[PDB]
Design a protein around this ligand. Structure first.
Ligand SMILES: NCc1ccccc1
Ligand SMILES: [Ca+2]
Length: 223
């Protein structure tokens, strides 16, 4: 997260870190047994880390649970990032309390102009590299469909939305990939792609979670 703020320990209790020997992507806990992340975050050997604030220090609220199954969306295209969503099943159910909790799936899609909360352990620099230890947050508005399409002509599908700031300075970044965009208490987006981080006229692009609720529900009912 570039241009954001320190969230506060365990204030984003649905945020997870995906770990393969090191943090590499975010995700969102949606059920005691399931995490939603980006399909571009797929890899074998994922450990899900719940209840994290500092990802480099054991602070006392963590649950580390190995993935038992990963399910990349059937129509994921890694070239365009269309359908950039994946479900991860946990080997055992997370224990739910204040510091670890699920986030609700949306009923309706989110509105242009709504201020959402984006969070993660990704790079904090637009130019150069610095990776934080504690969870960072950014309040960012959903941009209009026409603005989003102007920023990425020919590339925005109905399964994507932009959020952020055209002036630059405030954005998600590498390492935030797969993490949540929460609007009005619902998971509306997944950190997906863009062009760099916090550059002028290149806002973040997010998987539009409302289009996937039927697939998520059916998949969790059968796996
Ligand atoms: N600045 C949007 C973004 C986030 C994660 C990865 C690539 C691009
Ligand atoms: Ca920790």
């Amino acid at each position: 997260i570039v241009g954001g703020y320190t969230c506060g320990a365990n204030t984003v209790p649905y945020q997870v870190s995906l770990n393969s020997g090191y943090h590499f992507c975010g995700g969102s806990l949606i059920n005691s047994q399931w995490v939603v992340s980006a399909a571009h975050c797929y890899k074998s050997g994922i450990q899900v880390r719940l209840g994290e604030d500092n990802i480099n220090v054991v602070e006392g609220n963590e649950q580390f649970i190995s993935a038992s199954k990963s399910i990349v969306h059937p129509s994921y295209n890694s070239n365009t990032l269309n359908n950039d969503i994946m479900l991860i099943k946990l080997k055992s159910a997370a224990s739910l309390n204040s510091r670890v909790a699920s986030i609700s799936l949306p009923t309706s899609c989110a509105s242009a102009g709504t201020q959402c909360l984006i969070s993660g352990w990704g790079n904090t620099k637009s130019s150069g590299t610095s990776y934080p230890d504690v969870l960072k947050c950014l309040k960012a508005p959903i941009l209009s469909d026409s603005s989003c399409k102007s920023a990425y002509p020919g590339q925005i599908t109905s399964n994507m939305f932009c959020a952020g700031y055209l002036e630059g300075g405030k954005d998600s970044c590498q390492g935030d990939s797969g993490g949540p965009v929460v609007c009005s208490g619902k998971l509306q987006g997944i950190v997906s792609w863009g062009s760099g981080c916090a550059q002028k006229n290149k806002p973040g692009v997010y998987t539009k979670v409302c289009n996937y609720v039927s697939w998520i529900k059916q998949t969790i009912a059968s796996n």
